[PDB]
Amino acid sequence: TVEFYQRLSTETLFFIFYYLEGTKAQYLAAKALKKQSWRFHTKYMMWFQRHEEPKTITDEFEQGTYIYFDYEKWGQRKKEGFTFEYRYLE
Amino acid sequence: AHSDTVEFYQRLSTETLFFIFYYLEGTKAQYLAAKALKKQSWRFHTKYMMWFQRHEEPKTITDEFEQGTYIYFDYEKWGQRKKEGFTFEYRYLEDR
């Protein structure tokens, strides 16, 4: 169901997303995350979430501070003065 | 780390390990997850089929059972709960 993945911790959703590819579970984790206001950067291949309100927003990109989950370090990190180009959005 | 080792599931959070354990049933992952949980002093009660952890030193300890307070992961509510004056019978334990 959709509500279950809603309950799961974010770290659990990430594990599901990165290690159970091409499966239903991944599919619902992706959406569970989106509803939590995470967005997938299709290049960096990591999930981002606004830490606070962006500094600048145009029609093509926004810049500001974000927390993201680095799957290589398996840990939530933070980036300031980052430019999230919407063309890398799904 | 390499997904096929215990050092890998050791990096994951407990809740994730529980997810792995219940929803990737009968797989290598589940087994290594089970192991990961055991270093953390979680033990599997084979009747209730839930994981328990001593909250504090047990009150009584014999050869067949121990008694005291535990936290446990209820997989029907999917949440950590707590039990006082609980008897954990050693016959319902994976490996003595």
From Swiss-Prot, chain A:
It is found in: Cytoplasm; Nucleus; Cytoplasm, P-body. Changing R39Q: In IDDSADF; uncertain significance. Residues 3-90 are annotated as: Repressor domain. Disulfide bonds: none annotated. Coiled coil: none annotated. It comes from the Eukaryota. Ubiquitous. Highly expressed in brain, heart, thymus, spleen, kidney, liver, small intestine, lung and peripheral blood leukocytes. It is linked to Intellectual developmental disorder with speech delay, autism and dysmorphic facies: An autosomal dominant disorder characterized by mild to severe intellectual disability, developmental delay, delayed or absent speech, hypotonia, short stature, autistic features, and highly variable dysmorphic facial features. Belongs to the CNOT2/3/5 family. Component of the CCR4-NOT complex; distinct complexes seem to exist that differ in the participation of probably mutually exclusive catalytic subunits. In the complex interacts directly with CNOT2. Interacts with TIP120B and NANOS2. Interacts with EBF1. Interacts in an RNA-independent manner with BICC1 (via KH domains). Component of the CCR4-NOT complex which is one of the major cellular mRNA deadenylases and is linked to various cellular processes including bulk mRNA degradation, miRNA-mediated repression, translational repression during translational initiation and general transcription regulation. Additional complex functions may be a consequence of its influence on mRNA expression. May be involved in metabolic regulation; may be involved in recruitment of the CCR4-NOT complex to deadenylation target mRNAs involved in energy metabolism. This is CCR4-NOT transcription complex subunit 3. The lineage of its organism: Eukaryota, Metazoa, Chordata, Craniata, Vertebrata.
